[PDB]
Amino acid sequence: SGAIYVGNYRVVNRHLATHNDWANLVWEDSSRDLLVSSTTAQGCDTIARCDCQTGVYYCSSRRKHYPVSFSKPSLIFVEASEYYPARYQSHLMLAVGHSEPGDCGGILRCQHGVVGIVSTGGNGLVGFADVRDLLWLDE
Ligand SMILES: CSc1ccc2scnc2c1NC(=O)N1CCC[C@H](C(N)=O)C1
Ligand SMILES: [Zn+2]
């Protein structure tokens, strides 16, 4: 679990969005596993606007942060789950690092700010949904 709170927006994994997220919907994209809902309170986070390919992510299944080198956002095949049929997920970045399903929502940060959130993983891999292209989150 986990979310990004920036301005009057809450960014979550689409497959973990709550009834309240859907009732306050701003934007969602199944191909990215992202949903953004509106909030009444002002957020705590800021978004990176950069091309970093290294950073640090929070891994809830270890209660620890780990450094990672990750690929540029791209279209990657993701096998079927209870949440989605087998499909290509867009704007996904992969890295070598521990993850388990409950780790979705952990933040990836570089020195500039929030880069994205854990969205996929397995076998010593962890995948992050990028948010750096969503310029409207702070504009
Ligand atoms: C951190 S998630 C994770 C991690 C390890 C393992 S081992 C086996 N399944 C996983 C796993 N789950 C995972 O990749 N998906 C289930 C939730 C929706 C995801 C998506 N964006 O389509 C795909
Ligand atoms: Zn950066």
Side-chain angles (χ1 to χ4, degrees), residues 14-30:
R14 190 190 185 272
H15 74 276
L16 300 179
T18 68
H19 298 310
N20 275 320
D21 284 321
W22 278 104
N24 292 280
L25 178 68
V26 172
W27 169 82
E28 54 74 40
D29 183 337
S30 179

PDB file of all heavy atoms in Angstrom, residues 14-30:
ATOM      1  N   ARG A  14      -3.911   2.047  -9.445  1.00  0.00           N
ATOM      2  CA  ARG A  14      -5.335   1.943  -9.833  1.00  0.00           C
ATOM      3  C   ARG A  14      -5.967   0.701  -9.237  1.00  0.00           C
ATOM      4  O   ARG A  14      -7.111   0.743  -8.784  1.00  0.00           O
ATOM      5  CB  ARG A  14      -5.451   1.969 -11.353  1.00  0.00           C
ATOM      6  CG  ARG A  14      -6.915   2.120 -11.822  1.00  0.00           C
ATOM      7  CD  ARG A  14      -6.909   1.876 -13.338  1.00  0.00           C
ATOM      8  NE  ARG A  14      -8.216   2.086 -14.002  1.00  0.00           N
ATOM      9  CZ  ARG A  14      -9.145   1.147 -14.124  1.00  0.00           C
ATOM     10  NH1 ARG A  14      -9.002  -0.022 -13.519  1.00  0.00           N
ATOM     11  NH2 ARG A  14     -10.247   1.382 -14.838  1.00  0.00           N
ATOM     12  N   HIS A  15      -5.206  -0.414  -9.163  1.00  0.00           N
ATOM     13  CA  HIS A  15      -5.775  -1.662  -8.644  1.00  0.00           C
ATOM     14  C   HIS A  15      -6.016  -1.631  -7.145  1.00  0.00           C
ATOM     15  O   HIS A  15      -6.695  -2.560  -6.649  1.00  0.00           O
ATOM     16  CB  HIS A  15      -4.946  -2.908  -9.087  1.00  0.00           C
ATOM     17  CG  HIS A  15      -3.628  -3.092  -8.374  1.00  0.00           C
ATOM     18  ND1 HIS A  15      -2.467  -2.439  -8.760  1.00  0.00           N
ATOM     19  CD2 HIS A  15      -3.323  -3.899  -7.333  1.00  0.00           C
ATOM     20  CE1 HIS A  15      -1.489  -2.884  -7.937  1.00  0.00           C
ATOM     21  NE2 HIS A  15      -1.966  -3.761  -7.064  1.00  0.00           N
ATOM     22  N   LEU A  16      -5.482  -0.669  -6.428  1.00  0.00           N
ATOM     23  CA  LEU A  16      -5.686  -0.502  -4.974  1.00  0.00           C
ATOM     24  C   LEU A  16      -6.580   0.696  -4.637  1.00  0.00           C
ATOM     25  O   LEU A  16      -6.785   1.004  -3.447  1.00  0.00           O
ATOM     26  CB  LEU A  16      -4.338  -0.398  -4.257  1.00  0.00           C
ATOM     27  CG  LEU A  16      -3.406  -1.630  -4.422  1.00  0.00           C
ATOM     28  CD1 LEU A  16      -2.083  -1.384  -3.683  1.00  0.00           C
ATOM     29  CD2 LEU A  16      -4.085  -2.922  -3.944  1.00  0.00           C
ATOM     30  N   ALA A  17      -7.129   1.395  -5.648  1.00  0.00           N
ATOM     31  CA  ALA A  17      -7.955   2.575  -5.385  1.00  0.00           C
ATOM     32  C   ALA A  17      -9.196   2.178  -4.570  1.00  0.00           C
ATOM     33  O   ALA A  17      -9.794   1.129  -4.786  1.00  0.00           O
ATOM     34  CB  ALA A  17      -8.380   3.195  -6.702  1.00  0.00           C
ATOM     35  N   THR A  18      -9.569   3.056  -3.663  1.00  0.00           N
ATOM     36  CA  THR A  18     -10.740   2.821  -2.788  1.00  0.00           C
ATOM     37  C   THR A  18     -12.007   3.364  -3.406  1.00  0.00           C
ATOM     38  O   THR A  18     -12.002   4.084  -4.410  1.00  0.00           O
ATOM     39  CB  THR A  18     -10.498   3.506  -1.427  1.00  0.00           C
ATOM     40  OG1 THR A  18     -10.504   4.935  -1.632  1.00  0.00           O
ATOM     41  CG2 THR A  18      -9.217   3.046  -0.760  1.00  0.00           C
ATOM     42  N   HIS A  19     -13.176   3.071  -2.732  1.00  0.00           N
ATOM     43  CA  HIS A  19     -14.439   3.666  -3.161  1.00  0.00           C
ATOM     44  C   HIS A  19     -14.356   5.207  -3.153  1.00  0.00           C
ATOM     45  O   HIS A  19     -14.775   5.882  -4.108  1.00  0.00           O
ATOM     46  CB  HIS A  19     -15.599   3.250  -2.214  1.00  0.00           C
ATOM     47  CG  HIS A  19     -15.885   1.786  -2.175  1.00  0.00           C
ATOM     48  ND1 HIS A  19     -16.057   1.041  -3.331  1.00  0.00           N
ATOM     49  CD2 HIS A  19     -16.082   0.982  -1.102  1.00  0.00           C
ATOM     50  CE1 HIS A  19     -16.308  -0.197  -2.924  1.00  0.00           C
ATOM     51  NE2 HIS A  19     -16.324  -0.277  -1.582  1.00  0.00           N
ATOM     52  N   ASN A  20     -13.718   5.769  -2.094  1.00  0.00           N
ATOM     53  CA  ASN A  20     -13.545   7.210  -2.034  1.00  0.00           C
ATOM     54  C   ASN A  20     -12.673   7.774  -3.160  1.00  0.00           C
ATOM     55  O   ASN A  20     -12.927   8.860  -3.669  1.00  0.00           O
ATOM     56  CB  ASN A  20     -13.008   7.643  -0.699  1.00  0.00           C
ATOM     57  CG  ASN A  20     -14.116   7.815   0.263  1.00  0.00           C
ATOM     58  OD1 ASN A  20     -15.214   8.342  -0.076  1.00  0.00           O
ATOM     59  ND2 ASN A  20     -13.870   7.305   1.459  1.00  0.00           N
ATOM     60  N   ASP A  21     -11.588   7.034  -3.557  1.00  0.00           N
ATOM     61  CA  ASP A  21     -10.780   7.491  -4.691  1.00  0.00           C
ATOM     62  C   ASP A  21     -11.647   7.625  -5.964  1.00  0.00           C
ATOM     63  O   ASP A  21     -11.560   8.616  -6.698  1.00  0.00           O
ATOM     64  CB  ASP A  21      -9.641   6.490  -4.966  1.00  0.00           C
ATOM     65  CG  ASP A  21      -8.499   6.587  -3.983  1.00  0.00           C
ATOM     66  OD1 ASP A  21      -8.154   7.712  -3.589  1.00  0.00           O
ATOM     67  OD2 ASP A  21      -7.983   5.510  -3.560  1.00  0.00           O
ATOM     68  N   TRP A  22     -12.459   6.600  -6.240  1.00  0.00           N
ATOM     69  CA  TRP A  22     -13.312   6.602  -7.444  1.00  0.00           C
ATOM     70  C   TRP A  22     -14.402   7.682  -7.389  1.00  0.00           C
ATOM     71  O   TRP A  22     -14.695   8.314  -8.421  1.00  0.00           O
ATOM     72  CB  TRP A  22     -13.893   5.201  -7.662  1.00  0.00           C
ATOM     73  CG  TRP A  22     -12.925   4.264  -8.353  1.00  0.00           C
ATOM     74  CD1 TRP A  22     -12.195   3.252  -7.788  1.00  0.00           C
ATOM     75  CD2 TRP A  22     -12.650   4.217  -9.766  1.00  0.00           C
ATOM     76  NE1 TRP A  22     -11.486   2.585  -8.771  1.00  0.00           N
ATOM     77  CE2 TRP A  22     -11.687   3.209  -9.972  1.00  0.00           C
ATOM     78  CE3 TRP A  22     -13.037   4.999 -10.847  1.00  0.00           C
ATOM     79  CZ2 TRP A  22     -11.246   2.859 -11.265  1.00  0.00           C
ATOM     80  CZ3 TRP A  22     -12.554   4.672 -12.114  1.00  0.00           C
ATOM     81  CH2 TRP A  22     -11.648   3.634 -12.296  1.00  0.00           C
ATOM     82  N   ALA A  23     -14.874   7.999  -6.182  1.00  0.00           N
ATOM     83  CA  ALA A  23     -15.901   9.053  -6.019  1.00  0.00           C
ATOM     84  C   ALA A  23     -15.304  10.457  -6.189  1.00  0.00           C
ATOM     85  O   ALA A  23     -16.030  11.447  -6.391  1.00  0.00           O
ATOM     86  CB  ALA A  23     -16.511   8.938  -4.642  1.00  0.00           C
ATOM     87  N   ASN A  24     -13.976  10.601  -6.027  1.00  0.00           N
ATOM     88  CA  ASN A  24     -13.280  11.858  -6.202  1.00  0.00           C
ATOM     89  C   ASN A  24     -12.294  11.768  -7.370  1.00  0.00           C
ATOM     90  O   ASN A  24     -11.245  12.396  -7.361  1.00  0.00           O
ATOM     91  CB  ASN A  24     -12.569  12.214  -4.903  1.00  0.00           C
ATOM     92  CG  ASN A  24     -13.556  12.536  -3.802  1.00  0.00           C
ATOM     93  OD1 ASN A  24     -14.109  13.657  -3.737  1.00  0.00           O
ATOM     94  ND2 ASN A  24     -13.785  11.615  -2.923  1.00  0.00           N
ATOM     95  N   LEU A  25     -12.651  11.016  -8.407  1.00  0.00           N
ATOM     96  CA  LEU A  25     -11.765  10.740  -9.520  1.00  0.00           C
ATOM     97  C   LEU A  25     -11.355  11.964 -10.310  1.00  0.00           C
ATOM     98  O   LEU A  25     -12.217  12.781 -10.704  1.00  0.00           O
ATOM     99  CB  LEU A  25     -12.465   9.728 -10.446  1.00  0.00           C
ATOM    100  CG  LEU A  25     -11.672   9.354 -11.707  1.00  0.00           C
ATOM    101  CD1 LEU A  25     -10.419   8.558 -11.350  1.00  0.00           C
ATOM    102  CD2 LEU A  25     -12.551   8.480 -12.627  1.00  0.00           C
ATOM    103  N   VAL A  26     -10.064  12.109 -10.596  1.00  0.00           N
ATOM    104  CA  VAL A  26      -9.536  13.157 -11.473  1.00  0.00           C
ATOM    105  C   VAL A  26      -9.102  12.527 -12.796  1.00  0.00           C
ATOM    106  O   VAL A  26      -9.484  12.980 -13.875  1.00  0.00           O
ATOM    107  CB  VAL A  26      -8.344  13.879 -10.788  1.00  0.00           C
ATOM    108  CG1 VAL A  26      -7.657  14.843 -11.743  1.00  0.00           C
ATOM    109  CG2 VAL A  26      -8.817  14.626  -9.531  1.00  0.00           C
ATOM    110  N   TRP A  27      -8.360  11.409 -12.727  1.00  0.00           N
ATOM    111  CA  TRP A  27      -7.824  10.762 -13.942  1.00  0.00           C
ATOM    112  C   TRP A  27      -7.428   9.333 -13.581  1.00  0.00           C
ATOM    113  O   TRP A  27      -6.933   9.108 -12.462  1.00  0.00           O
ATOM    114  CB  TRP A  27      -6.571  11.539 -14.435  1.00  0.00           C
ATOM    115  CG  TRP A  27      -5.740  10.865 -15.507  1.00  0.00           C
ATOM    116  CD1 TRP A  27      -5.960  10.841 -16.866  1.00  0.00           C
ATOM    117  CD2 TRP A  27      -4.538  10.126 -15.282  1.00  0.00           C
ATOM    118  NE1 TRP A  27      -4.996  10.064 -17.480  1.00  0.00           N
ATOM    119  CE2 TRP A  27      -4.071   9.675 -16.539  1.00  0.00           C
ATOM    120  CE3 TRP A  27      -3.817   9.797 -14.139  1.00  0.00           C
ATOM    121  CZ2 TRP A  27      -2.888   8.947 -16.680  1.00  0.00           C
ATOM    122  CZ3 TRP A  27      -2.650   9.073 -14.277  1.00  0.00           C
ATOM    123  CH2 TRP A  27      -2.194   8.660 -15.537  1.00  0.00           C
ATOM    124  N   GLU A  28      -7.572   8.413 -14.487  1.00  0.00           N
ATOM    125  CA  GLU A  28      -7.102   7.030 -14.289  1.00  0.00           C
ATOM    126  C   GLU A  28      -6.682   6.428 -15.610  1.00  0.00           C
ATOM    127  O   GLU A  28      -7.233   6.788 -16.663  1.00  0.00           O
ATOM    128  CB  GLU A  28      -8.112   6.180 -13.546  1.00  0.00           C
ATOM    129  CG  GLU A  28      -9.515   6.141 -14.148  1.00  0.00           C
ATOM    130  CD  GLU A  28      -9.701   5.324 -15.419  1.00  0.00           C
ATOM    131  OE1 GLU A  28      -9.129   4.223 -15.550  1.00  0.00           O
ATOM    132  OE2 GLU A  28     -10.510   5.761 -16.280  1.00  0.00           O
ATOM    133  N   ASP A  29      -5.759   5.464 -15.560  1.00  0.00           N
ATOM    134  CA  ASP A  29      -5.291   4.820 -16.776  1.00  0.00           C
ATOM    135  C   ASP A  29      -4.902   3.380 -16.398  1.00  0.00           C
ATOM    136  O   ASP A  29      -3.870   3.136 -15.735  1.00  0.00           O
ATOM    137  CB  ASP A  29      -4.142   5.644 -17.381  1.00  0.00           C
ATOM    138  CG  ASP A  29      -3.605   5.116 -18.679  1.00  0.00           C
ATOM    139  OD1 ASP A  29      -3.774   3.919 -18.943  1.00  0.00           O
ATOM    140  OD2 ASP A  29      -3.005   5.913 -19.451  1.00  0.00           O
ATOM    141  N   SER A  30      -5.704   2.422 -16.844  1.00  0.00           N
ATOM    142  CA  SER A  30      -5.498   1.011 -16.590  1.00  0.00           C
ATOM    143  C   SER A  30      -4.161   0.558 -17.173  1.00  0.00           C
ATOM    144  O   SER A  30      -3.459  -0.293 -16.597  1.00  0.00           O
ATOM    145  CB  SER A  30      -6.628   0.214 -17.233  1.00  0.00           C
ATOM    146  OG  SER A  30      -6.465  -1.171 -17.028  1.00  0.00           O
TER     147      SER A  30
END
